[PDB]
């Protein structure tokens, strides 16, 4: 298991607890120096716990996929909740079965039908540590709508940081005063699989990606990642989805 607590919460704490989550990850071999996520993992083994701390020491409980990083559910005092897809209902079977009762989310996961959920986008909702322990909170006590924006905040800002060493600094830079993502930080949550792939099939192709990844840097402007001397490759990226999950 992981925690992390808001209590007295700082950049330092914070980056502990990233590194605590990405070493959390079970791995056998790196490709370009970056960890590969297993292809799969059998029975509970798949799920990491992460408990986490709102300021006044509340806590919830996060199930994490530890071949995706993909938040499945969360536990708040004797009530679980899942998202309402296949892979959730699967991990549904192996944690927070000790729960007095069980809710399935009216969406699934994903960042489409959570912004649907929220009636926003993600790039209209502040993130940062001061977010974090609001979404904390509002998991605590079911509001389908609130959870919908609390579990956007919660997913940007532990398992995207936990990816991307560039998110990370992105929430230390938020620890005191929460701010909408940048545009860079949206495009390499939803480029993550794409990069993860083409990483893994510049193996092979002499270091460069058989098609190239289009991201935002950090002055607004897009490029293109075409090969692994690219910085995001070479000092951002921190995690592989295995190509066999893509
Ligand atoms: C590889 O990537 C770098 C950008 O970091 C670029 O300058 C270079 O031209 C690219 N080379 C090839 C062969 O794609």
Known sequence: ??????????????GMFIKDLRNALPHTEKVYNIPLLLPSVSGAGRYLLMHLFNYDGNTITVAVDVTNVYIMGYLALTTSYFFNEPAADLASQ?????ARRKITLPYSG?????????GKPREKIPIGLPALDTAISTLLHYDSTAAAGALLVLIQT????????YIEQQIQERAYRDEVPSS??????????????????????????RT???LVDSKGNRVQITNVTSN?????????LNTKNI
């Open 110 to 118: 994903n960042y489409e039908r959570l912004q649907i959920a929220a």
């Open 1 to 14: 298991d992981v925690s992390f607590r808001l209590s007295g919460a700082d950049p330092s704490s914070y």
């Open 212 to 214: 190239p990844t289009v």
């Open 232 to 240: 995001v490759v070479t000092s951002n990226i921190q995690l592989l």
């Open 184 to 209: 860079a930080t949206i495009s390499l949550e939803n480029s993550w699989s794409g990069l993860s792939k083409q990483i893994q099939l510049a193996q092979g192709n002499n270091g460069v990606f």
């Open 94 to 98: 192996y944690v927070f079965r000790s």
């Open 158 to 165: 532990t398992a995207e940081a936990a990816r991307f060493k």
